[PDB]
Write a protein that binds this ligand. Sequence first.
Ligand SMILES: Nc1nc2c(ncn2[C@H]2C[C@H](O)[C@@H](COP(=O)(O)OP(=O)(O)[C@H](Br)P(=O)(O)O)O2)c(=O)[nH]1
Ligand SMILES: [Cl-]
Ligand SMILES: [Cl-]
Ligand SMILES: [Cl-]
Ligand SMILES: [Mg+2]
Ligand code: NA
Ligand code: NA
Ligand code: NA
Length: 326
Amino acid sequence: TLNGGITDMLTELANFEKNVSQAIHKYNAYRKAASVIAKYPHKIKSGAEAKKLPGVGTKIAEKIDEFLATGKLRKLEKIRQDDTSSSINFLTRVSGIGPSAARKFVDEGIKTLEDLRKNEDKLNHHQRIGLKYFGDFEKRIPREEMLQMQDIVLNEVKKVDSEYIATVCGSFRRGAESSGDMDVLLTHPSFTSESTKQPKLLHQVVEQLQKVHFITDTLSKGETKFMGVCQLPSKNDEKEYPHRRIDIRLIPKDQYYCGVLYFTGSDIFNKNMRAHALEKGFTINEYTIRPLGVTGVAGEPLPVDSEKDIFDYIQWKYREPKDRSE
DNA sequence: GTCGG
DNA sequence: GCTGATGCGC
DNA sequence: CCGACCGCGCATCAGC
Ligand SMILES: Nc1nc2c(ncn2[C@H]2C[C@H](O)[C@@H](COP(=O)(O)OP(=O)(O)[C@H](Br)P(=O)(O)O)O2)c(=O)[nH]1
Ligand SMILES: [Cl-]
Ligand SMILES: [Cl-]
Ligand SMILES: [Cl-]
Ligand SMILES: [Mg+2]
Ligand code: NA
Ligand code: NA
Ligand code: NA
């Protein structure tokens, strides 16, 4: 929060470009600028000072000067007053509704929560669940609650098959005091990059979690990725806990390190790391790290026995999860 | 919108 | 039905 | 300049 005003401004601009302008590259330019500035250990005094940082150019520098001088940005003031931009930005806050759908709904006259509620028939499955829990999905999850959730997921997975290994990743693994959702990486010896000796591995787990009433809804579900909703159980007479978003990713057991690096994030950290990889002649995904041939074609997966092995390949000093929050 | 070559 | 493009999400 | 901007799973669609 040392430069909270500036990072908040840049994030708002990032969201505008992503949701309204549908300019993904500008969205990322703004997110990168905010990221590097949030990391800066000094209270910024000028746009010139900020321009010294990578990711901050002439345009953002000028904006930072206006913000420092007035405490606001005219470009944003106008955007906030524009009904169409405001309507679109809002609708995209519903899980399942992206920039395209938002603009389409606005075209149809659907611009508010009230509109959405009376037009459920016009929403697909995912969007319908997103609307249902709109308020809940806005709430943060205290780490204490993440711990209780972890306890349940690990114990329930254990009950299904003692050979499963469930790991909570995301901001939780990075040690955050609160998270926006729960991300679970799952492995089982029967599923490797060499073969799938058992079917329904992910299904079995989802089924068990629904059985004990932990998972309450499903946004999407496939052989390796589950995206849904969960809820901690409450005690007699006490108010129910808010529903929470949960993602479960089944990854080949032999590709655990690339998978846990990916699922631990942050998302910006992953982008920065993968981009650096490219510069070093390697490409990284949640399964492997491969060298790039003189032609630019990915080669065979390199041996990996720790997250650190991945960092070494790209000549980066190792960074613990708690230091990957970019 | 910002960067490298 | 399939394959490929697109939206949306992590 | 001016191209490059991380990489991928699932849902939904068009075209066949
Ligand atoms: N490569 C890549 N990985 C991504 C991306 N988006 C997410 N991931 C990876 C890295 C992410 O850490 C992880 C989970 O996505 P999450 O959105 O739940 O991210 P967190 O958990 O970090 C946020 Br702070 P919250 O849940 O506490 O509010 O997926 C992306 O665009 N690219
Ligand atoms: Cl763009
Ligand atoms: Cl690995
Ligand atoms: Cl791969
Ligand atoms: Mg998360
Ligand atoms: Na700069
Ligand atoms: Na959305
Ligand atoms: Na998540």
